[PDB]
Write a protein that binds this DNA or RNA. Structure first.
Ligand SMILES: [Zn+2]
Ligand SMILES: [Zn+2]
Lengths: 358, 361
DNA sequence: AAATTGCCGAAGACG
DNA sequence: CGTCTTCGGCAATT
DNA sequence: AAATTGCCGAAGACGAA
DNA sequence: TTTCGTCTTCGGCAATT
């Protein structure tokens, strides 16, 4: 039953091959143009992130996320006051010249000014691409990305994400996040927290104070690693180990939310990251690979469903990396909307998931 | 018995006071030697340090009185030539220009002389040790088969420090290792692949039995990989971590090392055997029995017994494959006479059959 | 660049 | 069995 | 130095017993 | 049936030229 849904969601190699060929061509051209053109972004490097690169993209390979990350030495973060997720970026005392000086709006780094120049560079190179049908999508509120729309002829979206990279210890709001000690272990946690951290523009258009200078933490790199290294046993899903159903449960939950969001505008405020965050908590709660045996896919999916519903009921879904940041706060999603989603999930759960049959 | 093995482990356990005092002195001497070699105008200026062996693996028993340290020198653009299909032994040649590389005076042909390099390495170390006035330390006379310059420190307690000369190469490992490191069902394929992307090391064979190419033969060293495995030894990521379960893998290795050490002290016919034979055997046993549950501390006696049984079968069949170089038989007739292996079998059998009287000190 | 700095896991020491 | 402590390893940073 | 090279893990494609 | 084994391609990483 769920097995057939998973077969339907599984990507086809031909599609993957055709999509990746084009995406890689465009992205490499844009990355290299950025690295060579005289600008503040000369030093960008690429990190592929998101569902496709985590092997959990469903149905079609038509969405690609790519970070163009820029190391920014000697920064000092100022927490956007209550929120452990949002920050203003200031600079420690400079030796002989900050090359991001043109982007300073006060003492603070302007995400809006940096993004405008970044966007300008991408657009000017995209105009020169004559061998692929690609355009830059008009800027969207709340997005840290320059989005490309490719017609291959099939529609493919590529989010080029501007990120600042900082190699120091992670912000203190993350100190009690990443609770993987009983699952992936303390060596893994310590190693993950020695990798850099990333800030991307919040880019909200709400007109709130500091809107052009507010940055958001991103842990897409850590999430990617975890998805590829997700078992308590080192051999989980490897060629000399046992397959688990962890990723399959995530695919199913994303599909459920995707189908619901398709026909209910009441669910605009919900997104796949809510589901991803929920399953990370579930992987922490149930760390043993044997709790994710393929033979128990049905019960595993139901357990995840129950957990998500309880998050909705209690209006609490802690960010996995920033515990004090509630993705289900009233301020973020109205109490009315969570109740709506609960009802819908409860329906599908109690009626054999009809929405899975399109 | 369970009681005796527990008491033996208690006795073998190092004391923190002893550790602190030994490390303090060792660290001072090694740092001084490393900096001297890096600061001076010598062929060895780029050396970097890697601590290895039992102490740094947390399996040194009884006293913190033996320290191994590699001074590793990167050698870009070399070509290896396997010496007599041994798989463990190599001649080293240089690819090309600029021919203003160091080590040019170490060539005995197009072939890098281990003996010439080791002599200069030893000469530099000896000169600096002569200037050490705050610690009682001397350089031990060269020993056959050693890749190390050995220091003897009196702290006042005797401490030996092996300073090992190693060449570092960052390319893929020699082909003789291709089917070695059989950890795929235990530590896994990502771990194996990542470990085989670390550099490989060559150290002087430094034999003195007069064979051809004696001064130019190098042998592969996997001490860095072994150290990693010892600190990362569980099928579960949480093995022996603060939020995981303690296993008895290292404790079994301690017991077997102690057994061999005690037998070696009273029987000189066991001269051919060494702790590496024990280490190699247990790496195989960890591959054979990969589950952390197969190394539960409550089953210490049975775990030690299975390792003994496995070692005895290696002895009987005269075959103990190098864990990293499968075709290299540590228990071959050429390396260890048949009579010596039969003698050790009888002794281990006797100890096992009698509940380890030799452990009664 | 050398070498100080910060962190935290491993395992001995201590209620 | 828990919690404290010190040594070691790694790399960001000055 | 920027970018080719080489490896091999993850997982899709597919025939077999 | 479900699922090995085999073959395959795409991507991550870094040593190298
Ligand atoms: Zn798995
Ligand atoms: Zn363990």
């Amino acid at each position: 039953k769920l097995k057939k849904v998973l077969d339907k969601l599984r990507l086809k190699r031909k599609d993957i091959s055709e999509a990746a060929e084009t995406v890689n061509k465009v992205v490499e051209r844009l990355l290299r143009r950025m690295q060579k053109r005289e600008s503040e972004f000369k030093g960008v490097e690429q990190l592929n992130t998101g569902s496709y690169y985590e092997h959990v993209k469903i149905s079609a390979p038509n969405e690609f996320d790519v970070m163009f990350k820029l190391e920014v030495p000697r920064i000092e973060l100022q927490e956007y006051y209550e929120t452990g997720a949002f920050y203003l970026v200031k600079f420690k005392r400079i030796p002989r010249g900050n090359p991001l000086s043109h982007f300073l709006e006060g003492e603070v780094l302007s995400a809006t000014k940096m993004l405008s120049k970044f966007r300008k560079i991408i657009k000017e190179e995209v105009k020169e691409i004559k061998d692929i049908d690609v355009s830059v999508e008009k800027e969207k509120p709340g997005s840290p990305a320059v989005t490309l729309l490719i017609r291959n002829p099939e529609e493919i979206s590529v989010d080029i994400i501007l990120a600042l990279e900082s190699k120091g210890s992670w912000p203190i709001s993350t100190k009690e996040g990443l609770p993987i000690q009983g699952w992936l272990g303390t060596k893994v946690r310590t190693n993950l927290r020695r990798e850099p951290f990333y800030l991307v523009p919040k880019n909200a258009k709400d007109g709130n104070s500091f809107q052009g200078e507010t940055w958001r933490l991103s842990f897409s790199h850590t999430e990617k690693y975890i998805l590829n290294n997700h078992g308590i046993e080192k051999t989980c899903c490897e060629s000399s180990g046992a397959k688990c159903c962890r990723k399959e449960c995530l695919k199913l939950m994303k599909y459920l939310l995707e189908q619901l969001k398709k026909e209910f505008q009441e669910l605009d405020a919900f997104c796949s990251y809510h589901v991803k965050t929920a399953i990370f908590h579930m992987w922490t709660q149930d760390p043993q690979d044997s709790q994710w045996d393929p033979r128990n896919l049905s019960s595993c999916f139901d357990k995840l469903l129950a957990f998500f519903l309880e998050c909705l009921r209690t209006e609490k879904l802690d960010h996995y990396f920033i515990p004090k940041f509630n993705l289900f706060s009233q301020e973020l999603i109205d109490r009315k909307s969570k109740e709506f989603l609960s009802k819908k999930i409860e329906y599908e759960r109690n009626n054999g998931f009809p929405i899975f049959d399109k």
